[PDB]
């Protein structure tokens, strides 16, 4: 499903995202527009490291879900990355929140630094009442 940006908003909002670990709605809508542009069937392949991207946080599989055809992998979300490409984005949350657990926080994806990071994100959230 690709997700109007409110109702993805409003969604996460449900779903127990704002403020999570100190992270703010915005932040989290921030992560999602860049990553997959709020697509839950988002993919992409890193053929460096054979690893793959999934769904609309860009989960990936050579450390956070299983996918079988990445070497090396550990799976700290104890997630089937099929698991990530679901319209019903109550896994994808749960991984998120996992990985946010990390010291790094929302600074694991390495993009969110670049996109969002130290930025006026209030865009992301203007008018979805969340």
């Given at each position: 499903?690709?997700?109007?940006?409110?109702?993805?908003a409003?969604?996460?909002?449900?779903?127990?995202?704002?403020?999570?670990?100190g992270?703010?709605?915005?932040n989290?809508?921030?992560?999602?527009?860049?990553?997959?542009?709020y697509?839950?069937?988002?993919?992409?392949?890193?053929?460096?490291?054979?690893?793959?991207?999934?769904?609309?946080f860009?989960?990936?599989?050579?450390?956070?879900?299983?996918?079988?055809?990445?070497?090396?992998?550990?799976?700290?979300?104890?997630?089937?990355?099929?698991?990530l490409?679901?319209?019903?984005?109550?896994?994808?949350?749960?991984?998120?929140?996992?990985?946010?657990?990390?010291?790094?926080?929302?600074?694991?994806?390495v993009?969110?630094?670049?996109?969002?990071?130290?930025?006026?994100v209030?865009?992301?959230?203007q008018?979805?009442?969340?």
């Amino acid at each position: 499903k690709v997700f109007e940006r409110c109702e993805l908003a409003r969604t996460l909002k449900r779903l127990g995202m704002d403020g999570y670990r100190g992270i703010s709605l915005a932040n989290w809508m921030c992560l999602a527009k860049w990553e997959s542009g709020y697509n839950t069937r988002a993919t992409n392949y890193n053929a460096g490291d054979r690893s793959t991207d999934y769904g609309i946080f860009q989960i990936n599989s050579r450390y956070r879900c299983n996918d079988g055809k990445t070497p090396g992998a550990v799976n700290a979300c104890h997630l089937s990355c099929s698991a990530l490409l679901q319209d019903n984005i109550a896994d994808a949350v749960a991984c998120a929140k996992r990985v946010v657990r990390d010291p790094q926080g929302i600074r694991a994806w390495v993009a969110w630094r670049n996109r969002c990071q130290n930025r006026d994100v209030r865009q992301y959230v203007q008018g979805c009442g969340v």
